[PDB]
Symmetry: D2
Subunit: 267 residues, 4 copies
Amino acid sequence: GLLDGKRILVSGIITDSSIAFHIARVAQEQGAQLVLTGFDRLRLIQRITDRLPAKAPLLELDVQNEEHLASLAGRVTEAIGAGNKLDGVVHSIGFMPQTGMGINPFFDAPYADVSKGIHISAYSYASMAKALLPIMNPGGSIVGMDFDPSRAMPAYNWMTVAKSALESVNRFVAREAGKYGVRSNLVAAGPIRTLAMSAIVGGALGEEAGAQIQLLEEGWDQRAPIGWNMKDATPVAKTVCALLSDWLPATTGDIIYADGGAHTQLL
Amino acid sequence: GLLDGKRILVSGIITDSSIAFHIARVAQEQGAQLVLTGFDRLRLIQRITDRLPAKAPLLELDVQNEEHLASLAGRVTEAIGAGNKLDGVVHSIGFMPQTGMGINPFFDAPYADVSKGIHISAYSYASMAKALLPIMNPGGSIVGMDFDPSRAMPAYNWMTVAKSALESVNRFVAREAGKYGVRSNLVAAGPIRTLAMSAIVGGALGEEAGAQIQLLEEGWDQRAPIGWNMKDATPVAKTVCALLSDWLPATTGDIIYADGGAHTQLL
Amino acid sequence: GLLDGKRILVSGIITDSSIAFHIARVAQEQGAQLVLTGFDRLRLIQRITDRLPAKAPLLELDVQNEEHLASLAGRVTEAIGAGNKLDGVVHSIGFMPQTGMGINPFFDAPYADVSKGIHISAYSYASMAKALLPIMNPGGSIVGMDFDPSRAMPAYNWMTVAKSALESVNRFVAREAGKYGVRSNLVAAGPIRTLAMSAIVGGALGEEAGAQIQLLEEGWDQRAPIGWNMKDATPVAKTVCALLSDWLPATTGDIIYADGGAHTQLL
Amino acid sequence: GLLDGKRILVSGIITDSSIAFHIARVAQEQGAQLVLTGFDRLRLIQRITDRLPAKAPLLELDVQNEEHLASLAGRVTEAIGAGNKLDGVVHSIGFMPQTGMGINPFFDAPYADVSKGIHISAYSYASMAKALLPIMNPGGSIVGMDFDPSRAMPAYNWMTVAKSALESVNRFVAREAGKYGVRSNLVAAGPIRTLAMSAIVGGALGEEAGAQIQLLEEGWDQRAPIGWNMKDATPVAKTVCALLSDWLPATTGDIIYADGGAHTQLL
Ligand SMILES: NC(=O)c1ccc[n+]([C@@H]2O[C@H](COP(=O)([O-])OP(=O)(O)OC[C@H]3O[C@@H](n4cnc5c(N)ncnc54)[C@H](O)[C@@H]3O)[C@@H](O)[C@H]2O)c1
Ligand SMILES: NC(=O)c1ccc[n+]([C@@H]2O[C@H](COP(=O)([O-])OP(=O)(O)OC[C@H]3O[C@@H](n4cnc5c(N)ncnc54)[C@H](O)[C@@H]3O)[C@@H](O)[C@H]2O)c1
Ligand SMILES: NC(=O)c1ccc[n+]([C@@H]2O[C@H](COP(=O)([O-])OP(=O)(O)OC[C@H]3O[C@@H](n4cnc5c(N)ncnc54)[C@H](O)[C@@H]3O)[C@@H](O)[C@H]2O)c1
Ligand SMILES: NC(=O)c1ccc[n+]([C@@H]2O[C@H](COP(=O)([O-])OP(=O)(O)OC[C@H]3O[C@@H](n4cnc5c(N)ncnc54)[C@H](O)[C@@H]3O)[C@@H](O)[C@H]2O)c1
Ligand SMILES: O=C(O)CCc1cccc(Cl)c1
Ligand SMILES: O=C(O)CCc1cccc(Cl)c1
Ligand SMILES: O=C(O)CCc1cccc(Cl)c1
Ligand SMILES: O=C(O)CCc1cccc(Cl)c1
């Protein structure tokens, strides 16, 4: 197993189409022992994760709650046993209020909404590293989920700005994590048909926002030299597991693109 | 004159070493008619700007104050006369609380502080564009000040994250501004010895933060193929005026580097 | 005039739709005194440049001819007068044999053909700098023409590789030019309907190569926040003149994008 | 084993400090069956590779020899058996004549020398893909070795330009390889003390070239958040094996940085 004997915390599961659900499944297939964290709807998340190949403890974590963050390391240690530390951490958490996405004009998002989205989607990558690095082993790995924000695009709007901030945060987290012998990297995935993303394509955020996202998805598979299947998160999950493994030991502060190669092609 | 007959709003003057003070001076030397905006210490700013080559109206603008922003376009129109519009806007505004910079550990900045810095330094670029685009002429130009955040560095810490967010915001502002025939760009300057920056090199934010910034300054002049004079903001001011002029008419959503070429060289 | 009193060498005119023809016209409109260089068909080029606003001396320069390059500085000095030096140099030269472009498979271009294209399109930027820097004034400016090669695309094929090499060459030319007080930069233009480019869209290099280039052109105007007019080279010419002027004095080794902002937008 | 059952061709071994020697060793440790290719000194290379964990067939390949390239696929098939195909290809080949590196001025490299270096170091990545893709399995992987050329630096000179060309070639090879279900990527390594590199630091290419490279090496370990050991190629070799494996299945046309994170940090 690629991750045999490793203890890995995975955040971000909310449905069976969550990218983090497939990260967790593949990590368990490869021998990892998991601790899961979930936000708000813990009964739902427990029912969802009962379908993973192995039972895993589930801890509550709202990344805006400083009490959850202050207690997290102790709750993880209780779950994996005293004297044991984590080898890996997966941040698969993102949110932007509806005013910051969709057909709602870019200029009309109030800063309170933008700040909440940047808190959950970017600052919390530093928050989780701060909480968990003291209980991580040398040779460990922190991985977060990214969507390439180097160019503007329709509808993503303020979430694009949040991802730009996240990429910057990751480079600073690498500086801190390096003192522990730990790597920090992001995986920039192509579009994946989660429940939330299917709802937006179906017009949850306005019709032409849905139309624009559908056009973006189609161009992605066209550009990608090996194609891109938005209905299959397994290639993204495998890439996260590659970064959690010992096989990219000299990569940190960096971004790995699991996007079919689409970002390397103009058309 | 490069800017003859143009009406340009310039924010960000607080002392005679402010980058915006030199932008304003060079723009007036080149024939522009200015409206100035200032934050908080308006009596001080009026005294400072009395030393500009020409008298200019000074308007109060705290970019965190929605009432200041809601009234700004009307106050500008009163200052330049009904039926007149702006040809240019300069955003030269930045702030990050001390916890987000210096020797203070990156992980110890509370989100309230980071969010305030991102509000002032990044979101407000969109806020000012929203306020002023309705009173801008086709062919107009919005310019903001940047510090290349593509790599992490010591001490800049959360201000680096704010600049990453600003670069992303600029690409979305270009989308909106294009509907008015207006360009939006950033100037990424090398280090400039403002009053605040001299204080930090002198240890206002901790000793080794000051030591690290001094090392960064020295490496900049070494890397720059044409050298870099941190005591001379005129090359930065001229670059801003180039973007305000009609001579870069097909550049938008972009970043122009006024840094001596340092970012193009590894050592 | 933006370039009043400046002496500027302009290469690359072959027809009245050459980008260099419009660079030369705008530079003369702005007060520059020009020396022109032309390749092979000098009688044709003289007839073309008789239509410029002012008469300019025309010198022969095949950038693959070491004798032309060894004599160039002396021939320029004869044209502008002893004791006078150049303030600006424009490289607007590119060529790739047909096997390296179009529907002809990427793998089927022989290296002899690729090497000729890289010689003319990339190495010659260093060759011209070597020849002309000894007769350039401090504060001078070298500008070359680029087409953004950071992503692969259909049909451009080996010319894309040549532009990647050119961008690298430019960063090294900046190191050398800096010792003379001279800047070196590229302008990355959007697509322009030169005679050669119209012929390729019309199928000179194969039908689906023409089809692919037409699709690339259409997406460019769609992406550009201020639009893109492939029939109008004046915005590109003005950007070159901006870099030749004194108004971007701290930019070197760099690339300025005169592309409507298209490269800053995904769709 | 990470590469259990995979058939992989590895080029570029010349001494026991070659990066390709360590790629080959790690690949064999992980269960791969290798075919090796060597240039010119085949008796030496056979003696060197006798020290690998397993015996591997050695084929002659001068990438400038079209007869070697035309026969390569048939010689590989003879070595692995009819009906068998390759799963992986490693390009670890580079050369630039001495005039294109070191204290020898950048402008003094003749194009004949530069063209030879670009032939061996960049064009040959396309040459090898053309030769070997017809005998590669779907799901296969082509990997080449890179040194980040996005910024100029002392001494690397024309080899930097060759690496810029290689990165561009890789994006086009990905387009071709995708039709076979094959990925193409580069690994950008930090500096490694090969025999050639130790000789240059010792002044083989001039004293201040050696001095400049030693300064570059020292800054690399300082910048890298996890450090950088130029005497240990194993982290680079493991990264190549990661790309040869099935664990980065959605990455192509891309560059993975095995450099300690140094390129993500300014200082
Ligand atoms: N789906 C795509 O197309 C795509 C592409 C690239 C990257 N990503 C990124 O992948 C990450 C996971 O998103 P997803 O697509 O799997 O959608 P998802 O809705 O399944 O996951 C989002 C997760 O964020 C969590 N979350 C929200 N607020 C939180 C809080 N205050 N505290 C803790 N957790 C909170 C949700 O509970 C949920 O588990 C996100 O960073 C997303 O931006 C998604
Ligand atoms: N000095 C450098 O080295 C350097 C280098 C590159 C970029 N920059 C950028 O240039 C910009 C101008 O900074 P400076 O170096 O001239 O320093 P400065 O201190 O002279 O200017 C900062 C300005 O921000 C304004 N400001 C702060 N909070 C505000 C608010 N709530 N509303 C409105 N205005 C507010 C200040 O009043 C002040 O005028 C900043 O964006 C800075 O990041 C500076
Ligand atoms: N047309 C576009 O869409 C576009 C876009 C971006 C950049 N560019 C670049 O602009 C430059 C000028 O090209 P153009 O579009 O105006 O086409 P063009 O055909 O009008 O100019 C090409 C020039 O290269 C010159 N040339 C070729 N071989 C030469 C040699 N051995 N010695 C000296 N000169 C030689 C030609 O004589 C000709 O004057 C080129 O670098 C081109 O790549 C063009
Ligand atoms: N050593 C470093 O610091 C470093 C860092 C990053 C990347 N790289 C790259 O790694 C690759 C391998 O280089 P290395 O450092 O292991 O040095 P090396 O000298 O051990 O390997 C170079 C290889 O190129 C081969 N070669 C040269 N000409 C050839 C030809 N005509 N045909 C076939 N093969 C030929 C040599 O025989 C030799 O095996 C190169 O692309 C190099 O640029 C090296
Ligand atoms: O980050 C997310 O959750 C969604 C990422 C995304 C995919 C496809 C289109 C867009 Cl606009 C955005
Ligand atoms: O944006 C600012 O006001 C300061 C920019 C800066 C210059 C030199 C060093 C650092 Cl760390 C930061
Ligand atoms: O460099 C040149 O002369 C042509 C640049 C170009 C424009 C539009 C499409 C393509 Cl593929 C290439
Ligand atoms: O590609 C190669 O073989 C050498 C790469 C390299 C390492 C360290 C310093 C320099 Cl200048 C170059």
